[PDB]
Amino acid sequence: GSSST
Amino acid sequence: GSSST
Amino acid sequence: GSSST
Amino acid sequence: GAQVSSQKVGAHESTINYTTINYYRDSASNAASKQDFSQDPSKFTEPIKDVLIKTAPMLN
Amino acid sequence: GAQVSSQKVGAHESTINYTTINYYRDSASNAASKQDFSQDPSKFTEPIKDVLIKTAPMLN
Amino acid sequence: GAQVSSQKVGAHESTINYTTINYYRDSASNAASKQDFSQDPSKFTEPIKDVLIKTAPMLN
Amino acid sequence: EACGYSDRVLQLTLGNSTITTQEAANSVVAYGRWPEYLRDSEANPVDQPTEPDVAACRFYTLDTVSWTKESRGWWWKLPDALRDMGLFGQNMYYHYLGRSGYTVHVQCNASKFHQGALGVFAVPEMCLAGDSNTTTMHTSYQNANPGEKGGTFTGTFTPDNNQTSPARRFCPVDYLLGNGTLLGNAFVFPHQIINLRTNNCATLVLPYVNSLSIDSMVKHNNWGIAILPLAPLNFASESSPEIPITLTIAPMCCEFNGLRNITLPRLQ
Amino acid sequence: AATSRDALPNTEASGPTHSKEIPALTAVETGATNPLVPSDTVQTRHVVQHRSRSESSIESFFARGACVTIMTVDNSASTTNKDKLFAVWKITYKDTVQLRRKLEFFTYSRFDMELTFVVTANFTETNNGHALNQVYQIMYIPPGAPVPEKWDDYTWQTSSNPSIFYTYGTAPARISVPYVGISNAYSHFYDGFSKVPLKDQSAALGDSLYGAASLNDFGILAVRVVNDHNPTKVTSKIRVYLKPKHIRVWCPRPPRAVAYYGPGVDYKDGTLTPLSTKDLTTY
Amino acid sequence: GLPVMNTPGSNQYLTADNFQSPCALPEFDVTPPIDIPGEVKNMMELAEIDTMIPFDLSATKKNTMEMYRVRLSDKPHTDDPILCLSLSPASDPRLSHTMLGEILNYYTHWAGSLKFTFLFCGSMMATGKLLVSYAPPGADPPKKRKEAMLGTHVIWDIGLQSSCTMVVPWISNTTYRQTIDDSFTEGGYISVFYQTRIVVPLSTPREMDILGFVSACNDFSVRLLRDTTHIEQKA
Amino acid sequence: GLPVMNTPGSNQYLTADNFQSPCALPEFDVTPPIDIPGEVKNMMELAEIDTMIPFDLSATKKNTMEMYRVRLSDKPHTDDPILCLSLSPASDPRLSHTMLGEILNYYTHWAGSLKFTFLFCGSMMATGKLLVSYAPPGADPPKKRKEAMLGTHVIWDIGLQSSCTMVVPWISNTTYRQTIDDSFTEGGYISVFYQTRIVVPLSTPREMDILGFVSACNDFSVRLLRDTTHIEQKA
Amino acid sequence: GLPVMNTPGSNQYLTADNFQSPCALPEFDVTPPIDIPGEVKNMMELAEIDTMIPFDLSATKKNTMEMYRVRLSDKPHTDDPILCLSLSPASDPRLSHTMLGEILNYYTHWAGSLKFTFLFCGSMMATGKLLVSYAPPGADPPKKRKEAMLGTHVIWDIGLQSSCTMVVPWISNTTYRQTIDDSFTEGGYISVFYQTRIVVPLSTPREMDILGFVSACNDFSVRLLRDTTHIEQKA
Ligand SMILES: CCCCCCCCCCCCC/C=C\[C@H](O)[C@H](N)CO
Ligand SMILES: *C(=O)CCCCCCCCCCCCC
Ligand SMILES: *C(=O)CCCCCCCCCCCCC
Ligand SMILES: *C(=O)CCCCCCCCCCCCC
Structure with missing residues (x-):
């Protein structure tokens, strides 16, 4: 879905 | 994902 | 939606 | 990472929105949001040390 | 599979983000993230066997 | 309908991924996944009726 | 230490050999990496390695050279300088592949009335420039590899003009570090300085460095040792002072792969 | 966990001193650089440091495309003493000087290669006769694959070699290449030979170039105009730009100080004086 | 928009690209697969099969059946080579046309262990001991048993187990070797010698052939796809 | 669509862009990294290493080993400069070719503190006190100890600790200085003087060299990447 | 694809567009802002500051300091105008060059209330009553106090509070007026008259100046950005 760094 | 202003 | 391999 | 904001709708045909996604690492590459703030003119229009009350004599 | 990271915002008009999606199977096709690490210079600047205390005599 | 898979990362700058969406009804239109399997050579290298034990005499 | 221990006084022991010094300026470990054997996760040739341990990882002393007012500098290559050193050299020429780290100990004493300073540099891949301006990359194997005598630097580039029978040797100009880069910057390589008022030796511990885990020691040199007079030798008012410089070097954690008959190189 | 874009350390305020602590005295013989900061030798104020080293990270230092070669091709009628011109180039970063100098601050490197191709054409002779839009084939020929002898021979079929068919006037072409070295890193310097000269062998037979390892390190690019020839002559140039992405480097070196003179570290007589005159006590 | x-x-248009594209025959009724025997999933499976080496490429023997036959005889012991071969699997002329060699010519780089198996084809009454050698590169190529003994080797006793295998272990400086003759990535030397001699009784042929085979081990791989030089199309 | x-x-095509692009060698088997000693992560690490200054660029001494040697002698005390240098790390000819200087020539802007370390190379018997100065810009450049004393300085006593460091603290009007000679972003003046004098006993050399080194402090940074003028390719 | x-x-390429685009200097270390005094967030803040009106643009007084001075004297009462001005803030020559006027010339439309403040600069001993008028458009422009009285006005008594303000309230048919002379969006008439007369004692100047200022109220706005005619670049 989504990775958030 | 999503920001809503 | 999404598949993840 | 999508940013959803509302349009101020002028001529009409609920809130209409628009979507924005930044494609680059550098904030300099971004478009302008136009979501800007206003401020009071005072630092230029009333730069005096003692607060002005407009109904009062300016000089006392 | 979207990757969302923050920009270090330089000139200004919350955290501003940007989105990245890899379109290819080979990591070689990917753009550079620029999310890089730093390290201490020591292996080049203090390559000595006995740790240096800068207030102390270097030779003792 | 997005398919998310991992890249085998070769030169480096967690798992890096890439995204794939099929745009057409016919599987023939799809790109190749390159997610392929391997098999043992035996049907060509040891096609004999009685299993070979390599430490043993091949002929007995 | 209150029990006498000093940064200047060291003892090094490898195999049946010991070095003592009473005037060191600490010692250097190149890039902070101590020598190691090749790990299984980085291994490449699959045959059982030969590890000669104390038979080869011991201090070998090379031929002593002489430092004078006219000295421009000296250079050596590793493993080349050790190719004829006891069982290290034997193990090297019997195998296709070899890797090794080193303790390099440069020795030069004088007196409180002498002065001078040697920059001692260990350079990974110390490629040196040739003598020709009609051809490039043409220094012969024999001239590239002096063995223990090493070579020297010069203050002047002087091109080989015999085109019939070219010298095919290096012409390493000192202020250009023999490779077209400025000597003042050689300090980014692991180094020590022998400044005669301060110390009488330099000690460099070198890891095996290469773009491979193991390689041909006979075809390829991993490290270069360059010694140059940063401040010239001087003593009292003698016009012609001289003091000796001795190199003692020990292989460390060396291992060899690909055993066969011994290599007999064309060295002259 | 410290990142390239993190701010550098704050200056801490510091006052007068009178002690046995001697930061200023040191001994460069040890091989170490004295790790001093201004508060070690002067009085300082507190400063909140905002500056970062982001643009000098190895990646950011190299994150630019650099021209490494110019290839010339034409689209002319092949005639008994001269054939239609196709170009052949041995891949390298050493034909030009700027990227070479930057890479050579280091001994070894690993990176993915991004190649961008800028293509330009022109008429060479006066006739008002025209040409139609050209398509170019950029074939990568890895060491061992057959090199083309003619603009139109069988090798341009490319069943296995990667080729780019570039259309003139469209966006510059671009492909990526993984780290393809046969070693664990690319060697910017190789102090050695590819052959050992044996005594029982002739000198000629044991000979090889100083500092060269694999003869055809990375292979060839062969470029041609795919179009048949026009009555009028058109010449084209393919400028190749190399960017090292996802890069790592080891063992720092002093930069090239005198002009490059070939693929090795050799230098030419007459080029050895980089420094200019300046008096010791003149600012 | x-x-x-x-x-x-x-x-x-990059010929190596991997994109989607419109189908010219939409909704076409595809014929299903059936379970055909002999499916291959990776070219290295073929590299692991033994194929026979054209060892004797002499002017008269090359491009004939004879090139596969290595002649031995019952002559007195010698320390001189029965055969000498360079470990350059894609480029030495005796190896380059084997199935292994052929597949390697579609790739730029090879790595891993190999194995050579020899088959004795003399009569049952013929006996013998041979020495099969592999000398990793860097010294004088072996021309006498004395040198070849010092490297990797197998002493083969001829008997009921007709064949013998010598594994050439992956011993290299580089992580991959080039599939062309290259001194930097040279592989070394394969050679075969008489350990004792071939001995036969009376009424027996005094000369015979051995055949040789090469194949890749399970740790063997190739990379960087390329066109071969083993086929062309002039005009 | x-x-x-x-x-x-x-x-x-912007040469500075950062886009994805198709891989010409799909599924290529990459060789893994190994832990090679000496990895660098940022060019400023190299700027923090001491490299030696070519102080004496006189017509006869430049482009020779001599340019690195600053000659001192045991002459009577003078208030006259041993050396004078402009704090223009990328452009003053004595600094521009140091490793710091070199890296700065790939960037347009520099900022932060620097440090100069001097090494005394006379005999052990030689003694002395020197004054190392930094005068921030804007006044008459110091030519006498009298002026240099009034700025940032270190009085160096020669003895067993062979070397001495003077830190040039970041003192600037602008947040970054230009890497070229520019009056608006000028850095000021480095100079060295005799505080007392070099004294030697008999039987001792009366003249000797000091060597100087420059390196960046941990608060030092550069920005705006650019091509250098320190290399070219005519034809 | x-x-x-x-x-x-x-x-x-629309010059007014708002798109993203690649950065030519990636990872550049930006200098932070500092809190500089006087930040402006909207051009109308500047429109709300009083700036002085060049009322007397006579052939000899224009483009000199005199154009700002409106001369009064102690003459007997008259019903005749001290000054007459059209409410066309961006185009009447006396208003168009004020800061308000200037900003309005970068826009096509203006709306909202305005205010005129007059400053008496005679001596303390000088007294007087004046009438400041605003006549919305559509009738005969006032030339006599009689007419001007019937519109929006302030009777100003001169004394210790030196200045007096008349607010021109937003009174318009259209929601926005044009920033050019246009009859459909005309604004009307500003005028000033003597209510009684200026009276001075003996030993006092009989003539003096008043100065005038204009600024926008908080309900004032502009729209449709445009290039001004107040600057050009011939060749
Ligand atoms: C259709 C275009 C395909 C282009 C394919 C190019 C593949 C070859 C990549 C070459 C890698 C060159 C790396 C640079 C040089 C080396 O670092 C040094 N000289 C030492 O190894
Ligand atoms: C946050 O962005 C998560 C959702 C992702 C939505 C689709 C993104 C559309 C394509 C963006 C490509 C990346 C641009 C570099
Ligand atoms: C993770 O990626 C799940 C979300 C998918 C978001 C939309 C992707 C945008 C189009 C990508 C096409 C695939 C590229 C090969
Ligand atoms: C599964 O795909 C659900 C998520 C949809 C993600 C965005 C799709 C991007 C545009 C695809 C268009 C359709 C192609 C025919």
Whole structure:
């Protein structure tokens, strides 16, 4: 879905 | 994902 | 939606 | 990472929105949001040390 | 599979983000993230066997 | 309908991924996944009726 | 230490050999990496390695050279300088592949009335420039590899003009570090300085460095040792002072792969 | 966990001193650089440091495309003493000087290669006769694959070699290449030979170039105009730009100080004086 | 329309690309697979099969059946080579046309262990001991048993187990070797010698052939796809 | 198709861009890294290493080993400079070719503190006190100890600790200085003087060299990447 | 590739567009802001500051300091105008060059209330009553106090509070007026008259100046950005 760094 | 202003 | 391999 | 904001709708045909996604690492590459703030003119229009009350004599 | 990271915002008009999606199977096709690490210079600047205390005599 | 898979990362700058969406009804239109399997050579290298034990005499 | 221990006084022991010094300026470990054997996760040739341990990882002393007012500098290559050193050299020429780290100990004493300073540099891949301006990359194997005598630097580039029978040797100009880069910057390589008022030796511990885990020691040199007079030798008012410089070097954690008959190189 | 874009350390305020602590005295013989900061030798104020080293990270230092070669091709009628011109180039970063100098601050490197191709054409002779839009084939020929002898021979079929068919006037072409070295890193310097000269062998037979390892390190690019020839002559140039992405480097070196003179570290007589005159006590 | 910006690479055709594209025959009724025997999933499976070496490429023997036959005889012991071969699997002329060699010519780089198996084809009454050698590169190539003994080797006793295998272990400086003759990535030397001699009784042929085979081990791989030089199309 | 509208910038090639692009060698078996000693992560690490200054660029001493040697002698005390240098790390000829200087010539702007370390190379019997100065810009450049004393300085006593360091603290009007000679972003003046004098006993050399080194402090940074003028390619 | 269809507008460059574009200097270390005094967030803040009106643009007084001075004297009462001005803030020559006027010339439309403040600069001993008028458009422009009285006005008594303000309230048919002379969006008439007369004692100047100022109220706005005619670049 989504990775958030 | 999503920001809503 | 999404598949993840 | 999508940013959803509302349009101020002028001529009409609920809130209409628009979507924005930044494609680059550098904030300099971004478009302008136009979501800007206003401020009071005072630092230029009333730069005096003692607060002005407009109904009062300016000089006392 | 979207990757969302923050920009270090330089000139200004919350955290501003940007989105990245890899379109290819080979990591070689990917753009550079620029999310890089730093390290201490020591292996080049203090390559000595006995740790240096800068207030102390270097030779003792 | 997005398919998310991992890249085998070769030169480096967690798992890096890439995204794939099929745009057409016919599987023939799809790109190749390159997610392929391997098999043992035996049907060509040891096609004999009685299993070979390599430490043993091949002929007995 | 209150029990006498000093940064200047060291003892090094490898195999049946010991070095003592009473005037060191600490010692250097190149890039902070101590020598190691090749790990299984980085291994490449699959045959059982030969590890000669104390038979080869011991201090070998090379031929002593002489430092004078006219000295421009000296250079050596590793493993080349050790190719004829006891069982290290034997193990090297019997195998296709070899890797090794080193303790390099440069020795030069004088007196409180002498002065001078040697920059001692260990350079990974110390490629040196040739003598020709009609051809490039043409220094012969024999001239590239002096063995223990090493070579020297010069203050002047002087091109080989015999085109019939070219010298095919290096012409390493000192202020250009023999490779077209400025000597003042050689300090980014692991180094020590022998400044005669301060110390009488330099000690460099070198890891095996290469773009491979193991390689041909006979075809390829991993490290270069360059010694140059940063401040010239001087003593009292003698016009012609001289003091000796001795190199003692020990292989460390060396291992060899690909055993066969011994290599007999064309060295002259 | 410290990142390239993190701010550098704050200056801490510091006052007068009178002690046995001697930061200023040191001994460069040890091989170490004295790790001093201004508060070690002067009085300082507190400063909140905002500056970062982001643009000098190895990646950011190299994150630019650099021209490494110019290839010339034409689209002319092949005639008994001269054939239609196709170009052949041995891949390298050493034909030009700027990227070479930057890479050579280091001994070894690993990176993915991004190649961008800028293509330009022109008429060479006066006739008002025209040409139609050209398509170019950029074939990568890895060491061992057959090199083309003619603009139109069988090798341009490319069943296995990667080729780019570039259309003139469209966006510059671009492909990526993984780290393809046969070693664990690319060697910017190789102090050695590819052959050992044996005594029982002739000198000629044991000979090889100083500092060269694999003869055809990375292979060839062969470029041609795919179009048949026009009555009028058109010449084209393919400028190749190399960017090292996802890069790592080891063992720092002093930069090239005198002009490059070939693929090795050799230098030419007459080029050895980089420094200019300046008096010791003149600012 | 969605705002977009065309990047470099736009409109090119890279023959190695991997994109989707419209189907010219929509809704076509495809014939199902059936379970045909002999499916291959990776070219290295073929590299692991033994194929026979054209060892004797003499002017009269090359391009004939004879090139596969290595002649031995019952002559007195010698320390001189029965055969000598360079470990250059894609380029030495005796190896380059084997199935292994052929597949390697579609790739730029090879790595891993190999194995040579020899088959004795003399009569049952013929006996013998041979020495099969592998000398990793860097010294004088072996021309006498004395030198070859010092490297990797197998002493083969001829008997009921007709064949013998010598494994050439992966021993290299580089992580991959080139599939062309290259001194930097040279592989070394394969050679075969008489350990004792071939001995036969009376009424027996005094000369015979051995045959040789090469194949890749399970740790063997190739990379960087390329066109071969083993086929062309002039005009 | 999805409605799209091509924006300005479309089809250009910016050499500084950061886009994805198709791989010409799909599924290539990459060789893993190994832990090679000496990895660098940022060019400023190299700027923090001491490299030696070519202080004496006189017509006869430049482009020779001599340019690195600053000659001192045991002459009577003078208030006259041993050396004078402008704090223009990328452009003053004595600094521009140091490793710091070199890296700075790939960037347009520099900022932060620097440090100069001097090494005494006379005999052990030689003694002395020197004054190392930094005068921030804007006044008459110091030519006498009298002026240099009034600025940032270190009085160096020669003895067993062979070397001495003077830190040039970041003192600037602008947040970054230019890497070229520029009056607006000028850095000021480095100079060295005799505080007392070099004294030697008999039987001792009366003249000797000091060597000087420059390196960046941990608060030092550069920005705006650019091509250098320190290399070219005519034809 | 994803199927897409190029729409009208594709590849154009609209100077007013708002798109993203690649950065030519990636990872550049930006200098932080500091809190500089006097930040402006909207041009109308500047429109709300009083700036002085060049009322007397006579052939000899224009483009001199005199154009700002309105001369009064102690003459007997008259019903005749001290000054007459059209409410056309961006185009009447006396208003168009004030800071308000200037900003309005970068826009096509203006709306909202304005205010005129007059400053008496005679001696303390000078007294007087004046009438400041605003006549919304559509009738005969006032030339006598009689007419001006019937519109919006302030009777100003001169004394210790030196200045007096008349607010021109937003009174318009259209929601926005044009920033050029236009009869449909005309604003009307500003005028000043003597209510009684200026009276001075003996030993006092009989003539003096008043100065005038204009600024926008908080309900004032502009729209439709445009290039001004107040600057050019011939050749
Ligand atoms: C259709 C275009 C395909 C282009 C394919 C190019 C593949 C070859 C990549 C070459 C890698 C060159 C790396 C640079 C040089 C080396 O670092 C040094 N000289 C030492 O190894
Ligand atoms: C946050 O962005 C998560 C959702 C992702 C939505 C689709 C993104 C559309 C394509 C963006 C490509 C990346 C641009 C570099
Ligand atoms: C993770 O990626 C899940 C979300 C998918 C978001 C939309 C992807 C945008 C189009 C990508 C096409 C695939 C590229 C090969
Ligand atoms: C599964 O795909 C659900 C998520 C949809 C993600 C965005 C799709 C991007 C545009 C695809 C268009 C359709 C192609 C025919």
